Amino acid sequence: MREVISIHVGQGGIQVGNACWELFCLEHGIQPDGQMPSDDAFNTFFSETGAGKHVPRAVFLDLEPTVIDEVRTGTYRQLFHPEQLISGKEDAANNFARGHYTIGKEIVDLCLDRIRKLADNCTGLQGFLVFNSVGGGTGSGLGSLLLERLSVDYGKKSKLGFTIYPSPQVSTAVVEPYNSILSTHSLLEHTDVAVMLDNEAIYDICRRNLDIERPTYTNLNRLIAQVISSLTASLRFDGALNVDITEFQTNLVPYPRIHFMLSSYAPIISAEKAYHEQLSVAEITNSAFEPANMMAKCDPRHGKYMACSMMYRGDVVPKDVNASIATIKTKRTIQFVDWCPTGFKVGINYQPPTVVPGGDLAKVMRAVCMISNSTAIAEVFSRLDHKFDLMYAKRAFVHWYVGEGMEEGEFSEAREDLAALEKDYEEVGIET
């Protein structure tokens, strides 16, 4: 009786999610066509069609026809509903103004109606899931505009956004710093939780444990897709200690302003190697806080920690979970902030992670996904802050932006908000 609506937007947004469904689909056995081969735990992410196959709870919006139209001819041509794939005509072309003030408006009106129709079927709406990469054109605009509109129509429902940010040094576009600062401003005062999934960091995980010397975008997503499944694990399966989607933004956010965090997943072991490691819970948790294993290219050792939410999925006996947690406090390389003595909220699940055939993941019987808010986040904001200073120093590239309907001073106000955010974290970290 609890449902979640998933929203995908942006070339990456459509691409980032696509790794989610094939993993989710294979967990409950639903074939690609939707017919169930052979209890009702699947209602959390799917809706009955009254007879026959099912219907996922998602909507695809992307202004560029090509990426969205890719799914219209694949093997999944029999799964997604036809008329919920709203498609534009002209792409945002990496211009932050085009996707939010010039072309985005003419299609958002469709977006609200579709989302409204989907919810009407449900009755236990827990929250929303939105995927939107700040590193892409349409994601920045459509992502921001949708966020404001969604809040007004519905209000207090929980929202979680799996934004993907540019890496500290490796980048694809040349205007990524702008849309990041502009997009970040909008997302700060409207979202309840935002995560760090910088692409480069996930590269390191691939090259260390898996040891894949030639990884591409297809491979990156699955690991991301895994994180999505783990977080919702205690939502649609029986568990001794459950955590509610409402009970995530209840124990993680300490203050109204700070609503960001970065996650990590482990253990990630391949089949040829899993023959040598028992994968004991006493050890697996150890890799959780290992600075290398952080999904984001950031240094957890440059500051203090606020809170850590770790959901345990597998066969762990409850006793061990408590046993390993205390040892964590002993370590002198990880120090907690002064104003939080007790800071571990541990969730335990029963259903093990499922292995997508042909993937890198090897079936492992104890898995953990950690979401913790740490003071180290300000580093990424600071570094990105430096980028914006250099380019605007002589207002390079500004011409393309005011040419679509955005005011010149809009960039003036964008920096001030982030400046406040950068200052805010330093204020928190000071001990009493």
Binding site: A271, E272, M365
Partner: protein, 48 residues
């Protein structure tokens, strides 16, 4: 008082061995770092 390669050298031959994409994607060819399981147990508990 000029071979066949008079502008069309941009394309030719390209056996089915060269057409195959690179070497290995999302896959470690290393003997001990691969992902294929042994024939003894094609699927089973990989831990303790």
């Amino acid at each position: 008082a000029d071979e066949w390669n008079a502008g069309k050298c941009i394309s030719g031959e390209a056996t089915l061995k060269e057409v195959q994409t690179d070497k290995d994607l999302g896959k470690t060819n290393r003997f001990g770092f691969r992902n294929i399981t042994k024939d003894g147990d094609e699927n089973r508990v990989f831990g303790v």
